[PDB]
């Protein structure tokens, strides 16, 4: 689950925040929103940052249209496959 | 699951946005919110667009009272039946 989390967190941050210098905030940002997604928080108005109803309009930029596709795959794998594998283990 | 998604996405967009010219945004709009519903985002303040607490007051129009009924059926089929069928397959 942690590897799946980082496989999404790292590209999301890199695509959406391409002007960053090194900081320990990078560590937080690559884990934080992806973890809360496990529990069904999709951050609906942050998904497409170039939409009119976006709460992150300044983040709109080149390549940012990729991250909804990434998040679509992430939740399918994380929220549906991996959480229910863990639940299947707990059921045994 | 994809057919169920489009069976809801297409009427929702058509009823709520009846003045559209052809664009590739139509493709996004018929899939986007219906996909995030799979994961429990109901878009609560967008459901009834003619309500006082609606975040889409300009969308209020003829026939827009239909879309809460459509979304009620969609989530029951998608969120409850189809996701748990997929989970049942994963459990096997
Ligand atoms: C540096 C960061 C990466 C590593 C993660 C460190 C954190 C902790 C997690 C650790 C997870 C790995 C645990 C196994 C390795 C420890 C020893 C072990 O048991 O080895 C086994 C092989 O080991 C492998 O095959 C491991 C291969 C490396 C995996 C690296 C990615 C994992 C993290 C993914 C990224 C997300 C999570 C992390 C967040 C980034 C062999 O063991 P054994 O003793 O021969 O067998 C025991 C049974 N016996 C008694 C019968 C013999
Ligand atoms: C998992 C993948 C990510 C990368 C992995 C590598 C690890 C990365 C490690 C990073 C920690 C090392 C860098 C410390 C820098 C802290 C500076 C700072 O602003 O601190 C902030 C918080 O933090 C603290 O106050 C102290 C640090 C606590 C959090 C880290 C615990 C370790 C993670 C546990 C697991 C072990 C980790 C090991 C690996 C799993 C203080 O600022 P603020 O809270 O924003 O605001 C407070 C109020 N203020 C605004 C007035 C200030
Ligand atoms: C997959 C990884 C798991 C590995 C093990 C555990 C790893 C633990 C976590 C590692 C990530 C980094 C830890 C924090 C330190 C870096 C941030 C920092 O220094 O400061 C930041 C604050 O930081 C906080 O306030 C701390 C909150 C951290 C997230 C904890 C919840 C998510 C848990 C996820 C668990 C995933 C478990 C996965 C299982 C499925 C920012 O402060 P600053 O730097 O001053 O910046 C200025 C900010 N300011 C101006 C707004 C004030
Ligand atoms: C059933 C369907 C799946 C079929 C296969 C996969 C199909 C993949 C999906 C296809 C839908 C359409 C793809 C995008 C291209 C059209 C939109 C476009 O051109 O621009 C739009 C942006 O578009 C984006 O920012 C891209 C985000 C698309 C949504 C991805 C997540 C949903 C995943 C769903 C996955 C469902 C999986 C179902 C499984 C249950 C709008 O930009 P514009 O046109 O310039 O308009 C101006 C807007 N502006 C002024 C605000 C800037
Ligand atoms: C153009 C868009 C619609 C099509 C979708 C294309 C996308 C991809 C999805 C494709 C899903 C369909 C896969 C099956 C068809 C491929 C070949 C096949 O296996 O045929 C089978 C019959 O095939 C049918 O009965 C298909 C009937 C058409 C379904 C059209 C709607 C599906 C998409 C709904 C809309 C939502 C999803 C899409 C997003 C809009 C017979 O196969 P066979 O080889 O005889 O049997 C193999 C076993 N053997 C080796 C023992 C013999
Ligand atoms: C699934 C059911 C729906 C219909 C399906 C039919 C296919 C529909 C296909 C549509 C794509 C083909 C037409 C191109 C339109 C792009 C114009 C545009 O606005 O681009 C936008 C994004 O998009 C891009 O930048 C390029 C397109 C990438 C996303 C779509 C990939 C295909 C979906 C994958 C799966 C295969 C699909 C095949 C079938 C499954 C750029 O604009 P923005 O992001 O809004 O804003 C960014 C900032 N700006 C404002 C400064 C610009
Ligand atoms: C094995 C297959 C290999 C792939 C082959 C296909 C290759 C790709 C084919 C089609 C993708 C669509 C074309 C790209 C988008 C066009 C728009 C553009 O040029 O500018 C975009 C960025 O600038 C770029 O140059 C983006 C280039 C994308 C990199 C390649 C993506 C690969 C996708 C992975 C492949 C997965 C395939 C599907 C798997 C399920 C947007 O710019 P803007 O937003 O307008 O700028 C903001 C302006 N502002 C700052 C003022 C706000
Ligand atoms: C096979 C079974 C047979 C079906 C029999 C039942 C048939 C239905 C019987 C009754 C439905 C209720 C009556 C219609 C709505 C009343 C309001 C009205 O007249 O105006 C409406 C539009 O104008 C219309 O003419 C809407 C007509 C709806 C099409 C028919 C619906 C079929 C439902 C499917 C049947 C499923 C049955 C249940 C299944 C579980 C609203 O106008 P407004 O919003 O005031 O305008 C906005 C003004 N503004 C722009 C300034 C903001
Ligand atoms: C198997 C996994 C692959 C992914 C991964 O784990 C293992 O690989 C690790 C590499 C880490 C970075 C290494 C170096 C730094 C520089 C530091 O800079 C000082 C601070 C500054 C403040 O201003 C001084 O002034 C900031 C932190 C950063 C960017 C790390 C972040 C976490 C990263 C990306 C980790 C990530 C989760
Ligand atoms: C089995 C499934 C039934 C549903 C469905 O899949 C198969 O059937 C497909 C038909 C598609 C549309 C066909 C033609 C166009 C015109 C184009 O116009 C140029 C743009 C303009 C920009 O300004 C040029 O300048 C825009 C796209 C649009 C409306 C398609 C959208 C997706 C649709 C609705 C698809 C939908 C998901
Ligand atoms: Ca939920």
PDB file of C-alpha atoms in Angstrom, chain A residues 40 42 44-45 47-48 51 53 68 71-73 75-76 79-81 84 88, chain B residues 1 28 32-33 35-36 38-41 43 46 55 79 83 86-87 90-91:
ATOM      1  CA  UNK A  40     -12.384   8.048   0.512  1.00  0.00           C
ATOM      2  CA  UNK A  42     -10.938  12.441  -3.203  1.00  0.00           C
ATOM      3  CA  UNK A  44     -12.851  16.783  -5.461  1.00  0.00           C
ATOM      4  CA  UNK A  45     -12.222  20.451  -6.166  1.00  0.00           C
ATOM      5  CA  UNK A  47      -8.419  17.137  -8.875  1.00  0.00           C
ATOM      6  CA  UNK A  48      -8.574  19.246 -12.052  1.00  0.00           C
ATOM      7  CA  UNK A  51     -11.288  23.877 -13.929  1.00  0.00           C
ATOM      8  CA  UNK A  53     -14.575  25.374  -9.760  1.00  0.00           C
ATOM      9  CA  UNK A  68      -6.800  13.258 -12.770  1.00  0.00           C
ATOM     10  CA  UNK A  71      -5.605   9.740  -9.331  1.00  0.00           C
ATOM     11  CA  UNK A  72      -8.233   7.673 -11.141  1.00  0.00           C
ATOM     12  CA  UNK A  73      -5.809   4.751 -11.322  1.00  0.00           C
ATOM     13  CA  UNK A  75      -7.871   5.094  -6.100  1.00  0.00           C
ATOM     14  CA  UNK A  76      -8.965   2.095  -8.108  1.00  0.00           C
ATOM     15  CA  UNK A  79      -9.180   2.169  -2.403  1.00  0.00           C
ATOM     16  CA  UNK A  80     -10.736  -0.844  -4.140  1.00  0.00           C
ATOM     17  CA  UNK A  81      -8.017  -3.492  -4.607  1.00  0.00           C
ATOM     18  CA  UNK A  84     -10.196  -4.972   0.305  1.00  0.00           C
ATOM     19  CA  UNK A  88      -9.897 -10.098   3.130  1.00  0.00           C
TER      20      UNK A  88
ATOM     21  CA  UNK B   1     -19.115  -0.292 -14.544  1.00  0.00           C
ATOM     22  CA  UNK B  28     -14.714  14.919 -19.790  1.00  0.00           C
ATOM     23  CA  UNK B  32     -15.576  12.972 -14.539  1.00  0.00           C
ATOM     24  CA  UNK B  33     -18.079  13.457 -11.686  1.00  0.00           C
ATOM     25  CA  UNK B  35     -16.202   8.350 -11.735  1.00  0.00           C
ATOM     26  CA  UNK B  36     -15.506  10.124  -8.441  1.00  0.00           C
ATOM     27  CA  UNK B  38     -17.626   5.389  -7.322  1.00  0.00           C
ATOM     28  CA  UNK B  39     -15.436   6.383  -4.375  1.00  0.00           C
ATOM     29  CA  UNK B  40     -18.199   8.027  -2.362  1.00  0.00           C
ATOM     30  CA  UNK B  41     -18.026  11.651  -3.475  1.00  0.00           C
ATOM     31  CA  UNK B  43     -21.098  16.262  -4.710  1.00  0.00           C
ATOM     32  CA  UNK B  46     -24.344  20.128  -6.613  1.00  0.00           C
ATOM     33  CA  UNK B  55     -23.172  25.805  -5.470  1.00  0.00           C
ATOM     34  CA  UNK B  79     -21.405   2.222  -5.422  1.00  0.00           C
ATOM     35  CA  UNK B  83     -18.123  -2.118  -6.500  1.00  0.00           C
ATOM     36  CA  UNK B  86     -15.743  -6.380  -8.042  1.00  0.00           C
ATOM     37  CA  UNK B  87     -14.800  -6.877  -4.376  1.00  0.00           C
ATOM     38  CA  UNK B  90     -11.227 -10.029  -5.646  1.00  0.00           C
ATOM     39  CA  UNK B  91     -12.169 -12.025  -2.542  1.00  0.00           C
TER      40      UNK B  91
END
